[PDB]
Amino acid sequence: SSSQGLLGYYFSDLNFQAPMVVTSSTTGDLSIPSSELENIPSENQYFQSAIWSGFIKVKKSDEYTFATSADNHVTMWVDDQEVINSNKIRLEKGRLYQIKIQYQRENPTEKGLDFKLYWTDSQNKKEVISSDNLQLPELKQKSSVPDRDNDGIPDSLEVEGYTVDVKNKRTFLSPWISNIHEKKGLTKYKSSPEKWSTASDPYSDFEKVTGRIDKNVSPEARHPLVAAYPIVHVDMENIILSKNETISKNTSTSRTHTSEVVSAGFSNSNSSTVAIDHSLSLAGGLNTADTARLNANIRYVNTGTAPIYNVLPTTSLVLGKNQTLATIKAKENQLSQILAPNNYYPSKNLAPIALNAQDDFSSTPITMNYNQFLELEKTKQLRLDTDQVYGNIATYNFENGRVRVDTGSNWSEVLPQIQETTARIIFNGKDLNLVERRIAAVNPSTTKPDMTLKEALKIAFGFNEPNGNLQYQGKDITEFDFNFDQQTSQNIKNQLAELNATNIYTVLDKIKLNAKMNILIRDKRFHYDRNNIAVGADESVVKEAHREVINSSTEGLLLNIDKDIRKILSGYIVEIEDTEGLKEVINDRYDMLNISSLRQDGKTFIDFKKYNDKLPLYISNPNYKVNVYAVTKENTIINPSENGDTSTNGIKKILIFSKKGYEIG
Ligand SMILES: [Ca+2]
Ligand SMILES: [Ca+2]
């Protein structure tokens, strides 16, 4: 508990107008050595005034006399009862007494401040007040030292710009100073002087930048304009079907975002889609009055910016458009760990959660009638709808200076405000998964910081401009498309008009965000479905992606393929073409295309043996060709056609390799 003591404001001017340093002292020693004033301009290092605030707490009732290093330039009050300008004052045990210390000094010939706070009890024991008796003011939001929102940062600094510099034992909040601060690698902040939390979340602007916050809040959300909140969906890893009173397959799940009509949506609901493996795992009985049972392994996923402690959200497992087959619930207050941002529950190094645990004989079975099982087979897809019922928030406590789960703070009270006051940006550049972030933005309809689209991209997703050109990890911003909801689209379209700009990438630094916008940014190389899941890529892109052939034989192809490309590929078709042009498909079945696998070295191996009776391809003549085709997710057939055809005939495939027997060797 290091944020113990009084909160001090140090001004360079004589009448509390130019805040230079805002920081806390641990004990009665309120001194700031010039040694730690490096980032402050030489002249402003001469503090002409200062104000301290907090509370005093005594373990045993008694009468005290307060004094300071310079009683002549000070005015202190205890409970608004003026003590210095100095008589004894009684303080009962178990009571917090508010302190306010004022200090003015016109003639600083010295830099920094040497100023201590003392007190003497009834016996004549005089000593600098200990950390044990001091505590910061309750800088929490108010019911319905210029600090309109009570977060602790002066209104002027929030509006003008400020930064924080961690000294050896303290963190100094200071106004932004370009020449000094920029080249020191410090971040310039600007927050609303009217909002305790500028992004409307449970942590204040001061708590965020000063580090008086949950260790699990994402680094980017420690910025007062970036919202810190959980975002959870369920990830099904595998499933097993059985006849009620066996089909065991791997599943791929993707968090989703539904577009309307082409145009991103307004939904702030969680949901994921599961695709069950359609390929043979082994090889290969139900009637109209049987029932099948479903079990599966799952993990909760937090892709947001704040953790969860005592309530996992509820989820509906859905078949088709709206046939709920189960309601998945976790036990409130019985979590075995927290669900951290950019993390899982349970953690990936631990076993996943079974819907019906081997343990639990009393778990509700997930049942399907005969028609349902047919529907599931027909689609081989499931949906997981999850509510936004998170629990209590681990908040910072000024009394003890520790972060703890607060039973009085609840996410449900927070989410609506965050959603109404910020701009949403969903970006998939990291690994093609949809990642959502919310940035504080003004309701067009004079307090909040203006926010440009470029800056949002920088503080929320970590984009940068090494030469003034915005990029996300070496990838130019033009490699990503911008999609908006209808309203936002017209808004942006209008902004362009006033700028006489016809292109967005050209004026990103000048497009301003407003609260309630919905912006979707996706990698341009891929095909997306209505859920915004990457389901394909142009033939040209795919062909190009298979150019790096490290090896080829009658046994298989070894290649280097982009991780994002491999994600949109469902399978490969192997074929031998004779000198006549006639073909022979080796793995001639819609469920036998699962011949690719990633190696430890990250190289892809396409296995010719798998579906060739574990024997290497037999190329009767070296003038014969081996063609290998790639099938993408969106073109994947998962059942026999409607007659009964199970061949690869009719499958939209992309030629990605073709060489003669002698070229392959
Ligand atoms: Ca403030
Ligand atoms: Ca504020």
Swiss-Prot record:
Effect annotated for changing residue 587 to A: Decrease in toxicity due to decrease in cell binding
Effect of residue 230 to A: Reduced toxicity in combination with lethal factor. Decreased membrane insertion and translocation of LF
InterPro entries reported in the protein's UniProt record: Bacterial_exotoxin_B, Binary_toxB_3, PA14/GLEYA, PA14_dom, PA_Ca-bd, PA_dom_4, PA_heptamer_dom, PA_heptamer_dom_sf
Outcome recorded upon mutating residue 172 to A: Loss of ability to bind to LF and completely non-toxic
Record keywords: Calcium, Cleavage on pair of basic residues, Host cell membrane, Host endosome, Host membrane, Membrane, Metal-binding, Plasmid, Secreted, Signal, Toxin, Transmembrane, Transmembrane beta strand, Virulence
Result when mutating residue 417 to A: Loss of heptamerization capability
Effect of residue 484 to A: Decrease in toxicity due to defective oligomerization
Reported impact of residue 613 to A: Loss of toxicity due to decrease in cell binding
Effect of residue 621 to A: No effect on toxicity
Ranges for region Domain 4, binding to the receptor: 526-665
Protein name: Protective antigen
Species per Swiss-Prot/TrEMBL record: Bacillus anthracis
